[PDB]
Amino acid sequence: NLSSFTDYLRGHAPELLDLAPHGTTIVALTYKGGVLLAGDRRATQGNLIASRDVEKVYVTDEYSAAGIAGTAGIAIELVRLFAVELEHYEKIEGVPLTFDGKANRLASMVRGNLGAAMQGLAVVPLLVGYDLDADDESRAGRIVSYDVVGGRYEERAGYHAVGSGSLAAKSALKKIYSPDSDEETALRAAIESLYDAADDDSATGGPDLTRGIYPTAVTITQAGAVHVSEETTSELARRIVA
Amino acid sequence: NLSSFTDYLRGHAPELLDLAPHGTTIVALTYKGGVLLAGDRRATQGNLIASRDVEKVYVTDEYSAAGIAGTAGIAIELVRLFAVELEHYEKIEGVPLTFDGKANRLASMVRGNLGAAMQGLAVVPLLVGYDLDADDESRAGRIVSYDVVGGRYEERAGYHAVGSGSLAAKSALKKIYSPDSDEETALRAAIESLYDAADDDSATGGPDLTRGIYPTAVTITQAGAVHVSEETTSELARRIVA
Amino acid sequence: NLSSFTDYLRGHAPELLDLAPHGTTIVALTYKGGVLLAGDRRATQGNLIASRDVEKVYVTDEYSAAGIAGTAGIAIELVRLFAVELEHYEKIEGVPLTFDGKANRLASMVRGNLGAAMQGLAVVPLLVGYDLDADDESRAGRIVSYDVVGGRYEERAGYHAVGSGSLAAKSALKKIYSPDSDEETALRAAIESLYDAADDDSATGGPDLTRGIYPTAVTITQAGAVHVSEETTSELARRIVA
Amino acid sequence: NLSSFTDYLRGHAPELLDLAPHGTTIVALTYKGGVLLAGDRRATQGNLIASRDVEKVYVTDEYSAAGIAGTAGIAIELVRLFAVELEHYEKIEGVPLTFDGKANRLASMVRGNLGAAMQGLAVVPLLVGYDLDADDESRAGRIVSYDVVGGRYEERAGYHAVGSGSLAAKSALKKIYSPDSDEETALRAAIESLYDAADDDSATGGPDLTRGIYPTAVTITQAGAVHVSEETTSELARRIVA
Amino acid sequence: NLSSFTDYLRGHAPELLDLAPHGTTIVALTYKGGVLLAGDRRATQGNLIASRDVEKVYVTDEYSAAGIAGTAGIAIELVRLFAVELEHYEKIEGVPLTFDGKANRLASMVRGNLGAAMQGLAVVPLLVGYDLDADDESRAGRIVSYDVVGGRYEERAGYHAVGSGSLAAKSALKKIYSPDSDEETALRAAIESLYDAADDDSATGGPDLTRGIYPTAVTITQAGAVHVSEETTSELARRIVA
Amino acid sequence: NLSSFTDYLRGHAPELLDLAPHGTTIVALTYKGGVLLAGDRRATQGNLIASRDVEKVYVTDEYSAAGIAGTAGIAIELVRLFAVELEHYEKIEGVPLTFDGKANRLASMVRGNLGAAMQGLAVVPLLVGYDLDADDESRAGRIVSYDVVGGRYEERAGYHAVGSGSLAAKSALKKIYSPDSDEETALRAAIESLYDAADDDSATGGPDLTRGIYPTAVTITQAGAVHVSEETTSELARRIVA
Amino acid sequence: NLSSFTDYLRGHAPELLDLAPHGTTIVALTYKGGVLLAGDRRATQGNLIASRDVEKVYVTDEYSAAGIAGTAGIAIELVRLFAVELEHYEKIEGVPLTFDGKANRLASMVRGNLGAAMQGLAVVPLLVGYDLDADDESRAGRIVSYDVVGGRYEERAGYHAVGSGSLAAKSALKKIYSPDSDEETALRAAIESLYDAADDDSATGGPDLTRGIYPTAVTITQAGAVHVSEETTSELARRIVA
Amino acid sequence: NLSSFTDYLRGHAPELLDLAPHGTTIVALTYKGGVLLAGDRRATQGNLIASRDVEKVYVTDEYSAAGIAGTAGIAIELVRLFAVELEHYEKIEGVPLTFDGKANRLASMVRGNLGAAMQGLAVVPLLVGYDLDADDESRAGRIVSYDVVGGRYEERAGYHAVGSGSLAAKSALKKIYSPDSDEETALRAAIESLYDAADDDSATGGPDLTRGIYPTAVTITQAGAVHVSEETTSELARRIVA
């Protein structure tokens, strides 16, 4: 009734707003074309590995996507809803939400979990998208990070990450990353830091050539967001190794 | 229904009223023309730096603005709402609120966070503005400080500050500051105390010439409020150094 | 004065009896010749990897050795002391201790740490050796496991393990292992289970071909104990992979 | 009576074995000649800066030195004592201690503080030295790291660090450091990671060109250990900058 | 709907009924003409001085005023509301409230804060006024003191006080005060005890000649209540001094 | 039996090693001649003033003295003992202790109160002295500060302070102070910051012209230490005022 | 709507149903004519005297009154309300309530406060009255006492009391009191026990000839209740003294 | 064995170093002749008066005496011992202790009770005496106050007091007392403040003309200390009353 699918639940179906299978690291890079997301796939509840093929990065809509780090359970339902929220607002308003809209909405959905957060079950996302409304379609990619209390923040440094090995990955990028670059160079630097995060963090554990476990990725550009192929990544991670 | 945007939510949408990325220092000076705000840009969750380019001062309206210190997440949404509260009161009443009104409002919104305040997540703002209704348009610049329980307070000493390094900056100004002065001299004493604050406080860390991290400022006068330029600041902090 | 180096400390220098860098998995296998130990080399304090080259298995004396799992700091000093407890008893008595002696001593040393155990800083070892006093030099290899309260337990099943990934390894061996076998077959089955333990346990993380991190091993026989080479392990784990 | 200055106090003057002024980061690099230590100089009690000129690295003896991170009060006395323990053992024995001795001693002194550690007042050192007893005088420089429960650990990666910005610095070196290099190159990479540690950690805050606050350093080689000059550091950090 | 501005909020806007900037002492004297209030101006949060110019006494209505000691945030809003409660009741009823009414109201507002009181944020007022309904217009000035649980109490001793230095001041007056006197004499004895309160209480700190910090005062009589001039105070405190 | 008076008690009379009357601020300045101490005289238990004439600075020996902040009771006996420790070491050794000795001693005595410290009853001293063994008798003045855990620290900035208002006084000096200066100029900057300390701190309250309460001072030079006269202070604080 | 003023609040204005100024002793006596109450006038919060002229006995209606002991604030409002509860029932029903009615009502009002009771802020009253419906107008005086949980109890022994010094007074009366007697004899015995209660109880403190502090009294009879004069008490307590 | 009776117990009989009957107020005045002590006599355990004739001030020796406030039990034994301590040191050394000796000794005895103190059972004395060694026998009287942690303090203001009504008494004296005066004027001012203390404190309760309870006093002068007669006080307190 303000075109918020969420807010509809709010008034018509409220029941929809390490004890359980944890998180992992996720990286974000800006570049000439657009932007991209790459994130590990290891879900760990304790020191015990619970799953090694869990997708952490999802495509929210046509020109954006986000990766969520924290309690798998809570993080999944949350992104699915965020997606819905965005789609519904389009089918109703006719148009899609600004990028700054999608973000402020995601924030609200985060600010909403703050209760569970202070109770251990916290989640935090990393939002990326091609700003169809950006003046210079050159730097039209964007990266938004979040709080637990629901703060929205602008990247403004070309990259960022969230999760256990984020401090690691962020540091690797501080070196292995440079502005305006290929959607091949970036997707490379990504698989990289995601390798370094795995080095200094048992909770991540990036590319594992022996098992066939490869980082999940997604690139967004003036054409939209597309999930990178399992081939473009593996023959890409093999390249990174030495 | 009293022209309060807030109060509308109060009754039609109540869901809008170091675990997460902290604060920083913000100064305020009075002068001949009007008044101004200058604040650090370093957000620190823990002892770890979370961002070095965060803006802490915003322009609330044509003839006023404020800076907030405390949980970034909470502080942001809070000022964004304050801005709206004001703009909406204008469009409805046709006229704007007294300065004393804008203040009493901001304080109500602060009192409203008292709950979160007593749970660590506190925030406190610094409000400044050119009082279009002041008898002597000479001393028409004002500074209001706040409690946590939402008390409103008048500067009456030409300067103030809030944040970890406030105690330090206040003391610097207690020396490097003098009444009626240039909108070049005050902006000068502001980048100054903002420097001394960073000296005796790892949570602040004002002007960093090596990184390109400069203090955010904003001045308000009989012409309104305007955000100082990145240039007017850097070539200004270089002057301060020695 | 009972030929116990320890007991000498007991009466003449008593000061020698995840806040800090944790444990890992260690396996023990019995076979035709004798017995062996193989342990991971990853030390993890928290979910963070602290070291990936830490040796967990040590050769206690000519015909025995043991791997200890638990607080690295407490576990190091404990084995070293055990070693000395052994060597000193020989030099003094002229002969060496029975294997059942060496074990009962090691048990005493564990019992001693129970204090620290009940405060998180616990440690548990795995003891193996060629019993020069066993009747049938065919099954002369032995495995002793321990409690926290200082219990001594006999393997009697050809294999055992201790650590975070022990439950895993134990199970892999419950399959990939068979009695009387090569000191090549068992050194094989060890690297194996040491691989499966790493699969279902982020704390362990066995053979990592990409980094050059290989499991440490040791085999004791009628000739005595000797530390397997870095070559006999890598070209051995490569074989294991698929 | 075992040549242990310490042990004499133990039996003849036992009274010598953020409420108060904290720590900072320290780095350690290995190279062709020998090894070195470089560490920040900022002491921080709270978020407040307590001193910006505190030396964190000391030369323990002719061929060795160490940096200690943790409560300054406890860390000072502890190293001064280690110094003496080493010197006294010499004058008595006539010869000096093995390097492996000096470390085992240092570790015992740390294990000694474990009580205070589990009460907040913890301290951890990083030990380096030119092993006069090493076979290949090429890789004769060594790095030992410690636990809180007193574990002794070998570097075996050419670099290491301790302190708040340690995770940072360690990561910077993971990129900017290469084996066998100059005692100019390493001293370079040190001041570097020490800069990066200050980037992502308010508790550190490396080279400050504006204030004249430069990292403290020390190199040890076949000639012994010598404290690098204030000039060799500043005209070195200026170089690092861009 | 009982002419209670308060009670309207009660049913139509309930949201209006040392972490934060504390109190100070306030004195009350009776005399020939009417009565008066004089109170310190130092707000102290901790041992730290937060403001030295805060007015603690306000004129509630034509013939009455009150001073409130306790958490400044809570004490301000509370008196401002009491003000309104009184004024609104008039405009509606046409006539004003008895004095005994104004107090009974004030007490209810205090009883209202009892919740916050039992949580540290307590506030207590001191009420004075010229009972236009008193038989002998000689002793027509009155003093009412309060509880925290909201008790209303009559002075009946010509003077009283509240705040940290209250015990002090009350004692000074027990000596330096005499019944029926000038509105110069009482204003004199007030500035006096207010000086003595500052002698034995760091939280107060009355007249400060050097800084120009003078006690705030207010007298009420058959003409009404009027705030004493900054001159009548300073040239009055100078007199008191020796 | 090591010429330590203390140590004698240690073994022959061990019984000598806001519930109760608190502290205050104390400053220290370096200069051409020597160095000096100036400290407040207001003792405050609670928010209540307990005494306004207490001396916080004492002359430890011919060429040194110190001021202590923290529980008065503890602080007194502590300095009295320090004095004796020194004098007794002289009479026995015939010579006096290095300045660096007197310091190391004072720190041991502080470490000795660590127990009481962690129970609220803490105390911290400021030691100053003319180093009769300093190469350049120009900068022969020294300032040593302390931890609570007994750390010793060198000023190396010409000035320091300890106490509630230290933060304030330090900041004042950070402005009103300059190197090599008169023993009239420094004593001037001392009464100054001692004034600003009292401005932003109710626990201090420096120079009070109205009461006759003046800051206690002491200067040490190549001639020794001498306690400044009540006159040299009053006619000095009158000069400072405006 | 049952003629209960209270019950009207219950459904139309519910907001009307030693941190703060305590109680005192109150006595009740039966006699020929009717009954009476006499109570101390000292309010004590802590060990500190807060007021020495507070009236504890009030006349509820024409033929009854009561004294309340406990939290002054809670006790005041409670009796006032009782009064009104009574008067209103008359105006409405036209006649007055039975005495057994007035009591059962008062009991209900007490039962209501039980909440606050169990939190320290308790209060207990003593109710007396001339039962216009008693058969033998000789013993028409009555005394009712109460619980905290709201129990109603009959005297049936001519006297009773409540307060800190009650145990004392009760005992004095157990001696100095006899049935059917003058309203001069009983007013005498009351001032007496009210004297002994003060002897063995610093909280009470009856008749103080030196200060002019005299016990408050009230006598109800077939004529109704009337408050004894200040003369009939002082010249009455003077008689009691020796 | 240092002439300390106490210290003898220390080594030969250690067992000699509101649940129970409390304290009271005690005053101290200086004057032309010598000095004096006067203190209430009411012992209160709770709000209940336990005794009204308890002597609180004792004559320590020929030229000194002290009053103790706190737990009667602990305060009695303590002063008796202090007396003994003083007498014994005379019989042994031949001479009596300096005044400054007696005081430092008393302090030690207080510092000794600090354990019980932090457990409620605290005591604190007020020491007075004629300093046989004072230069100007005019101001030869002295007043020493104490801490709980055993601090010793000099009066230096002519008067002081300890106990519940000390804040009161101290204030009364701030007015009713002047320097050099009669041993009749002072003993008057004493009985005075001791009257005022009783006014604002149920725990004291000075002169009671009706019961015959009179303040106990003691004067010391160049002739020695003598306990004032019951007559000199009563006919003295009657004089004070109006």
What is the secondary structure of C93-129 as a DSSP string?
HSS---HHHHHHHHHHHHHHHHHHHTTT--EEEEEEE
**Is the distance from CB of C71 to CB of D149 less than 8 angstroms?**
yes
Q: How far is CA F62 from the centre of its chain?
A: 15
Partner residues linked to G51 by β-bridges: G43
Overall resolution, Å: 3.2
In terms of Cβ atoms closer than 10 Å to its own Cβ (0-12, 13-18, 19+), residue H84 is: middle
Q: Closest Cα to residue G38, out of G65, G60, G63?
A: G65
CA torsion G109→G115→G120→G121, rounded to 10°?
-40
Q: Which residues of D touch F150 (CB under 8 A)?
A: 73, 77
Distance from CA of A93 to the nearest CA of D (A): 43
Q: Which amino acid is at D220?
A: I
CB G110 within 8 A of CB G146: yes
State how far the alpha carbon of H75 is from the alpha carbons of A223, H52, H110, H154, H167, in Å.
89, 17, 10, 21, 20
The H or E element spanning position A59 is strand A57-61
* Cα(E188)–Cα(E176) distance, integer angstroms: 10
Do you know the residue count of chain E? 242
Strands A43-44 and A49-51: antiparallel
Kindly report the number of other CB atoms within 10 A of residue B132's CB atom.
Answer: 15
In the 8-state DSSP scheme, what is residue C39?
E
**Dihedral sign of CA atoms H4, H10, H14, H19 in order:** positive
* Cβ contacts of H7 on chain F, cutoff 8 Å: 13
Order of all β-strands in the sheet with G216-221:
G159-162, G26-30, G35-39, G216-221, G224-226
Q: What are φ and ψ of residue E217, in 5° steps?
A: -140, 165
Residues from chain B that touch A153, judged by Cβ atoms under 8 A, are 21, 51, 54, 72
* Cα torsion B41, B46, B49, B50: sign: negative
Q: Three-state DSSP class for E227?
A: coil
Instruction: Name every residue whose Cβ is closer than 8 Å to that of residue G215 and which is 6 or more positions away in sequence.
Output: G38, G39, G40, G41, G190, G191, G194, G206, G207, G233, G237
Number of domains composing chain D: 1
CATH of residue E175's domain is 3.60.20.10
Q: Which domain holds residue B69?
A: 1-242
Residue whose pair of structure tokens reads 């004593």 in the numeric block: F187
Residue B14's φ and ψ, nearest 5 degrees, are -65, -20
From D171, which residue of chain A is nearest by alpha-carbon distance?
Answer: A171
What is the DSSP pairing of strand F152-154 with strand C57-61?
A: unpaired
Q: Are B183 and B36 in contact (CB under 8 A)?
A: yes
Backbone angles phi, psi at A194, to 5 degrees: -70, -15
Nearest-by-Cβ selection for E202 from F199, F205, F241: F205
DSSP codes joined into one string, chain F: --S-HHHHHHHH--TT---S-----EEEEE-SS-EEEEE---EEETTEEEES----EEEEETTEEEEEEE-HHHHHHHHHHHHHHHHHHHHHHSS---HHHHHHHHHHHHHTTHHHHTTT--EEEEEEEE-TT-S-TTS-EEEEEE-SS--EEE--SSEEEESTTHHHHHHHHHHH--SS--TTTHHHHHHHHHHHHHHT-TT----BTTTTB--EEEEEETTEEE---HHHHHHHHHHH--
- Experimental technique used to determine this entry: X-ray
Cβ–Cβ < 8 Å for C217, C189: no
* C-beta atoms of E202 and F200 within 8 A: no
Q: CA C181, CA H51: separation in Å to the nearest integer?
A: 94
Beta-carbon contacts below 8 Å between A and C: 41
CB of C118 less than 8 A from some CB of D: no
User: E115 to chain G: nearest residue by CA?
Assistant: G116
Structure-derived torsion over alpha carbons of residues E86, E92, E98, E103, reported in degrees to the nearest 10: -30
User: After which residues does chain B break, using C–N > 2.5 Å?
Assistant: 17
* Facing residue for B47 by CB, picked from D203, D209, D241: D203
Nearest alpha-carbon partner for H29 in H235, H239, H234, H215: H215
Question: Nearest-CA residue of chain B relative to D213?
Answer: B199
Contact assignment for D77 to F117 by CB distance below 8 Å: no
Whether F201 and E48 lie within 8 Å, measured CB to CB: yes
D157 Cα to chain B: minimum distance (Å): 26
- Which stretches within chain G are classed as H helix? 5-12, 72-93, 99-117, 166-176, 186-199, 230-240
CB atoms < 10 A from the CB of B1, how many? 9
Asked if F8 is an interface residue toward chain D (Cβ–Cβ < 8 A), one would say: no
F 164-203 residues inside an 8 A Cβ radius of B: 167-168, 170-172, 174-176, 196, 199-200
Q: Which of C24, C25, C30, C221 is catalytic?
A: C24
**Quick check: E180 and E193 in contact, CB under 8 A?**
no
Name chain B's partners: 3 or more CB pairs within 8 A: A, D, E, F
Which residues from B are below 8 Å from E73, CB to CB? 111, 147-151
Touch between chain G and chain C (3+ CB pairs, < 8 Å)?
Answer: no
No. of H helices and E strands in chain A? Answer: 7, 12
Residue B214 Cα distances to A152, B69, B170, angstroms: 22, 18, 19
**Measured distance CA(G126)–CA(G66) in Å, rounded:** 5
Convert chain B into a string of H (helix), E (strand) and C (coil).
Answer: CCCCHHHHHHHHCCCCCCCCCCCCCEEEEECCCCEEEEECCCEEECCEEEECCCCCEEEEECCEEEEEEECHHHHHHHHHHHHHHHHHHHHHHCCCCCHHHHHHHHHHHHHCCHHHHCCCCCEEEEEEEECCCCCCCCCCEEEEEECCCCCEEECCCCEEEECCCHHHHHHHHHHHCCCCCCCCCHHHHHHHHHHHHHHCCCCCCCCECCCCECCEEEEEECCEEECCCHHHHHHHHHHHCC
A166-176 vs D166-176: helix axis angle to the nearest 10? 40
| Catalytic, out of E24, E30, E44, E204 | E24
Of the partner residues H199, H202, H210, the one whose CB lies closest to the CB of residue G202: H202
Check if G19 contacts H (Cβ < 8 Å): no
